[PDB]
Write an enzyme that holds these catalytic residues in place. Structure first.
Site, PDB file in Angstrom:
ATOM      1  N   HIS B 327       1.279  -6.307  -3.682  1.00 29.20           N
ATOM      2  CA  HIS B 327       0.482  -4.985  -3.683  1.00 29.20           C
ATOM      3  C   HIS B 327       0.984  -4.038  -4.697  1.00 29.20           C
ATOM      4  O   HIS B 327       2.270  -3.410  -4.346  1.00 29.20           O
ATOM      5  CB  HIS B 327       0.115  -4.506  -2.458  1.00 29.20           C
ATOM      6  N   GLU B 357       0.330   2.558 -12.670  1.00 26.83           N
ATOM      7  CA  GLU B 357       1.400   2.664 -11.659  1.00 26.83           C
ATOM      8  C   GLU B 357       2.731   3.530 -12.511  1.00 26.83           C
ATOM      9  O   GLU B 357       3.152   4.467 -11.988  1.00 26.83           O
ATOM     10  CB  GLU B 357       2.110   1.407 -11.485  1.00 26.83           C
ATOM     11  N   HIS B 487     -10.873   3.716   6.991  1.00 23.19           N
ATOM     12  CA  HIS B 487     -10.321   4.841   7.141  1.00 23.19           C
ATOM     13  C   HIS B 487     -10.933   5.738   8.305  1.00 23.19           C
ATOM     14  O   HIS B 487     -10.146   6.727   8.891  1.00 23.19           O
ATOM     15  CB  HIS B 487     -10.888   5.896   5.963  1.00 23.19           C
TER      16      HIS B 487
END
Ligand SMILES: *[C@@H]1O[C@H](CO)[C@@H](O[C@@H]2O[C@H](CO)[C@@H](O)[C@H](O)[C@H]2NC(C)=O)[C@H](O)[C@H]1NC(C)=O
Ligand SMILES: *[C@@H]1O[C@H](CO)[C@@H](O[C@@H]2O[C@H](CO)[C@@H](O)[C@H](O)[C@H]2NC(C)=O)[C@H](O)[C@H]1NC(C)=O
Ligand SMILES: *[C@@H]1O[C@H](CO)[C@@H](O[C@@H]2O[C@H](CO)[C@@H](O)[C@H](O)[C@H]2NC(C)=O)[C@H](O)[C@H]1NC(C)=O
Ligand SMILES: *[C@@H]1O[C@H](CO)[C@@H](O[C@@H]2O[C@H](CO)[C@@H](O)[C@H](O)[C@H]2NC(C)=O)[C@H](O)[C@H]1NC(C)=O
Ligand SMILES: *[C@@H]1O[C@H](CO)[C@@H](O[C@@H]2O[C@H](CO)[C@@H](O)[C@H](O)[C@H]2NC(C)=O)[C@H](O)[C@H]1NC(C)=O
Ligand SMILES: *[C@@H]1O[C@H](CO)[C@@H](O[C@@H]2O[C@H](CO)[C@@H](O)[C@H](O)[C@H]2NC(C)=O)[C@H](O)[C@H]1NC(C)=O
Ligand SMILES: *[C@@H]1O[C@H](CO)[C@@H](O)[C@H](O)[C@H]1NC(C)=O
Lengths: 167, 597
Positions: B327, B357, B487
């Site tokens: 991941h 990233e 969530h």
């Protein structure tokens, strides 16, 4: 010279080895020497001090600076006459699970005087109620330690510094 | 020695010790995440519990400095971020019970399963297999079975636990002078005592509600288009004046409409821009990708990578037995150690996740000089916004055809850019009503304005009124539909995904305007311009040391979040939609339902 330039162990910053010494060309063609900006020159006898500090602190060993090194550990005068050299020792002064045998001081009651060395180990007192020799609230132990490890970015690695003095 | 020098002296020692213990804990967690065994689990949990205990002791110790006497700002910010009582203000029994129901809710959501009605020995979990039907099937009955069964066989186990999670959380938040848990959550966008950049915990509601009122003219048109297109794949199930059944929206909840692209594609004869073949034809390895990413980042003026980043990072999938966690993430181990963990393939999506990233890593590198406690984005929504604008800008033909992946010829038409903009809107705009409505529901539940015998009634009323989505089977008060989302049942705030979507386009517009762009906004690329890099760095290098309403002004020019940049981004799609719905009925009525007949 041969002794404090390539020895097996170096000294900590709060208590640095000192040598009053009773061939310059050989030091140059050697290890990277990541800084060699001296001042005094472009003698009776010379002193050669040395210690081990962090990377991003090397710019504090100089006339007229400020930090937890040039206020409590090592200070040069404004009319400095010798010079300074500093280089990397990441492979010889670091180990997994930390190298806790290098210390520095970050608490003091008065800023250092030029060319002075402080070995005292009294418990620092910040508050107003005296501490009487025991840690706790507002009273700390003033000698922390770098956790030197090899997987640090350049700037948190160990650097060996050597200062030569003139008179 | 007054009150402030003591706080400063204490913060020095805290910074030192915390930096050390944090580096140890993070290194353990990395060494576990990239190489799984049975001893690394213990080597990680040891350091984790040690760090938590140290933080708890230091927090208990930092309560002896009255906050109402510190006159500095950064000292007060640190001491206040450290004095937070958090949990454990409750008694012991209540704390243990809260932990237990949190664990039970997470376990129920993770390992719950539903099976076929004609062969009950063929169950299938949620992740690999249930939300694969929702995102791929074109059968009405199969999608309806999946949607109904998940909520009826897992949502009904989470209700009696949620009903007391609410009470315990409300009481914990009231024991900290916060007035409810929703206020505790909104207490992140707060600024106090800067004389010009104030922000209350109660103005976030007003600002969200006022900026959502300007998105509706575009969301209604996208809604009308999606409906008139779905009415050709499920004929006689959609009504041309009604809402959309909640099981036809692409995934189990309708959070993103991005799986409807094969059904509602504007011009289906024009292939999309997709460079995967021209990367393989040039032997682009798993390391040329990151080299090009670093080149893009250093072009605008940001630094290189630390050279400790290249050796320690796990860029490719390892060998035979090195089982890892694939991941993509960016790690900020501290002490000057930044790393990236991702298992990259030779594709185009990884070519963008690389830039994302590395943007995270650049943000992490910029503010590494601040004190320990002040290393974070200005609020919850800054980090992902900064990460996202890079991926937004690195996926344009004006950049691909200069990297070397596309022929220098091959000019693009306008149909291709309408395709691109519609696929962008199906996942950027189609998720704002959902986020706003879910967070409004949770705030009203915590506040006390929805008694616990009216949860599902209000939930489906608001779903029909705000999002435009009607349920396909009546749900009484024994269900709990919100808790069937990750969530909600794992206690994560959800408003960040709404402010991030606005900050991102504000950043992109303010950066494209300094790079002297001329065309529409969806074609701009910030590469090769130094002013944009400087304008972004002058906010990256701040961290949490300044109120977010000042960091936002350093880059853009305003103090609060705006919405005009987003509509400016989507303008061409808006005009085309406004000219493609002359005959349909723009809007919806909240009375039709697929079972009313
Ligand atoms: C620095 O000290 C090291 C040893 O502490 C010296 O290393 C020796 O170098 C000579 C000549 O290259 C070799 O013959 C020896 O075998 C080395 N010793 C070891 C243990 O390897 C080095 O020469 C010194 N350099 C300077 C410039 O003083
Ligand atoms: C990944 O983890 C495995 C097991 O957790 C490591 O395997 C052992 O590592 C120790 C570490 O010194 C060695 O002494 C053993 O000989 C290893 N045994 C086997 C069967 O591999 C492995 O080393 C870790 N990966 C890396 C790169 O160190
Ligand atoms: C207390 O506030 C003062 C100013 O309000 C801060 O002073 C700054 O300190 C940094 C660190 O040395 C300097 O680089 C700045 O130039 C200082 N600003 C000014 C205007 O002189 C001080 O840092 C604050 N206290 C702490 C612990 O950060
Ligand atoms: C944080 O929690 C503590 C209890 O865990 C609250 O209570 C004070 O704790 C201190 C700890 O030394 C005692 O000396 C006080 O007598 C306690 N009562 C008070 C201050 O009324 C504390 O008030 C809480 N503070 C915050 C900001 O939440
Ligand atoms: C894409 O550009 C073409 C090129 O003009 C557009 O085609 C025009 O469409 C209008 C529609 O009112 C006609 O009046 C013109 O005659 C067309 N141009 C030509 C050269 O025949 C097309 O409409 C554009 N498509 C979109 C979605 O914007
Ligand atoms: C950024 O600008 C540089 C220079 O202005 C570009 O690099 C050169 O671009 C010209 C024009 O195509 C080529 O002829 C040269 O061969 C390029 N040099 C190199 C070393 O690649 C660069 O392409 C621009 N980058 C982007 C993303 O547009
Ligand atoms: C980044 O690295 C390249 C070589 O990898 C080097 O030429 C360039 O000067 C570096 N950039 C900076 C700002 O140091």
């Amino acid at each position: 010279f041969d002794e404090v330039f390539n020895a097996t162990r170096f000294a900590s910053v709060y208590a640095w080895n000192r040598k009053r010494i009773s061939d310059y060309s050989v030091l140059y063609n050697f290890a990277p020497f990541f800084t060699f900006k001296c001042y005094g020159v472009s003698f009776t006898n010379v002193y050669a001090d040395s210690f081990v500090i962090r990377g991003n602190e090397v710019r504090q060993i100089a006339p007229g600076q400020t930090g937890n090194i040039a206020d409590y550990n090592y200070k040069l005068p404004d009319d400095f006459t010798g010079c300074v050299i500093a280089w990397n020792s990441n492979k010889l002064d670091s180990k997994v699970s930390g190298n806790y045998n290098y210390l520095y001081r970050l608490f003091r009651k008065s800023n250092l005087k030029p060319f002075e060395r402080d070995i005292s180990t009294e418990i620092y007192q910040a508050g107003n109620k005296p501490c009487n020799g025991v840690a706790g609230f507002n009273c700390y132990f003033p000698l922390r330690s770098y956790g030197f490890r090899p997987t640090y970015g350049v700037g948190h690695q160990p650097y060996r510094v050597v200062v030569l003095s003139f008179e | 020695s007054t009150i402030e020098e003591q706080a400063k002296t204490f913060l020095d020692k805290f910074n030192h010790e915390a930096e050390d213990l944090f580096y140890q804990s993070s290194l353990a967690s990395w060494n576990y995440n990239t190489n799984i065994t049975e001893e690394n689990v213990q080597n990680m949990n040891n350091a984790g519990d040690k760090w938590s205990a140290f933080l708890k002791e230091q927090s208990t110790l930092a309560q002896m400095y009255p906050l109402q006497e510190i006159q500095n700002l950064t000292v007060k910010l640190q001491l206040q971020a450290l004095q937070q009582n958090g949990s454990s203000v409750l008694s012991e029994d209540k704390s243990k019970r809260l932990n237990t129901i949190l664990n039970t809710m997470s376990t129920i959501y993770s390992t719950g399963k539903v099976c076929n009605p004609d062969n009950p020995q063929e169950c299938l979990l949620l992740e690999p297999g249930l939300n694969e039907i929702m995102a791929n099937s074109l059968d009405y009955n199969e999608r309806l079975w999946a949607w109904e069964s998940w909520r009826s066989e897992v949502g009904k186990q989470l209700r009696p636990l949620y009903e007391e999670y609410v009470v315990l959380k409300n009481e914990m938040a009231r024991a900290n002078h916060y007035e409810d848990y929703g206020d505790y959550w909104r207490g992140d966008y707060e600024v106090n005592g800067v004389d010009g950049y104030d922000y209350s915990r109660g103005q976030l509601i007003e600002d969200v509600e006022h900026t959502f009122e300007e998105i509706k003219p575009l969301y209604e048109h996208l809604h009308a288009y999606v409906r008139a297109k779905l009415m050709n794949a499920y004929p006689s199930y959609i009504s041309p004046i009604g809402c959309l059944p909640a099981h036809l929206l692409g995934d189990m909840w309708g959070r993103f409409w991005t799986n409807l692209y094969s059904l509602t594609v504007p011009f289906g004869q024009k292939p999309n821009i997709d460079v995967t073949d021209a990367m393989v034809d040039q032997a682009w390895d798993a390391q040329r990708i990151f080299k090009e990413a670093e080149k893009f980042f250093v072009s605008v003026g940001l630094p290189n990578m630390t050279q400790g980043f290249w050796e320690n990072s796990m860029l490719t999938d390892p060998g035979n037995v090195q089982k890892a966690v694939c991941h993509p993430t960016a790690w900020d181990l501290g002490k000057g150690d930044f790393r990236i963990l991702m298992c990259t393939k030779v594709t185009m999506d990884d070519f963008l996740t690389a830039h994302h990233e590395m943007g995270h890593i650049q943000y992490d590198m910029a503010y590494a000089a601040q004190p320990f406690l002040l290393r974070n984005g200005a609020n919850e929504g800054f980090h992902e916004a900064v990460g996202e604008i890079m991926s937004l800008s690195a996926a344009t033909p004006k950049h691909l055809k200069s990297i070397g992946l596309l022929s220098p010829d091959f000019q693009e038409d306008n149909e291709t850019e309408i395709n691109f903009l519609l696929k962008q809107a199906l996942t950027i705009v189609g998720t704002l009503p959902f986020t706003y409505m879910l967070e409004k529901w949770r705030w009203m539940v915590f506040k006390g304005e929805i008694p616990k015998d009216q949860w599902m009634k209000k939930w489906w009323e608001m779903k029909r009124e705000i999002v435009g989505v009607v349920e396909p089977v009546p749900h009484d008060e024994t269900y709990c539909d919100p808790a069937s989302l990750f969530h909600v049942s794992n206690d994560y705030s959800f408003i960040r995904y709404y402010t991030r979507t606005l900050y991102q386009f504000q950043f992109q517009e303010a950066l494209c305007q300094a790079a002297k762009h001329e065309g529409p906004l969806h074609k701009c690329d910030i590469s090769n311009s130094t002013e944009a890099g400087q304008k972004l760095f002058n906010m990256l290098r701040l961290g949490k040391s300044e109120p977010w309403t000042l960091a936002l002004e350093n880059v853009v020019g305003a103090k609060n979040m705006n919405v005009r940049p987003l509509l400016n981004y989507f303008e061409p799609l808006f005009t085309w939609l406004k000219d493609q719905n002359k005959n349909s009925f723009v809007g919806w009525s909240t009375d039709w339902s697929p079972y009313a007949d």
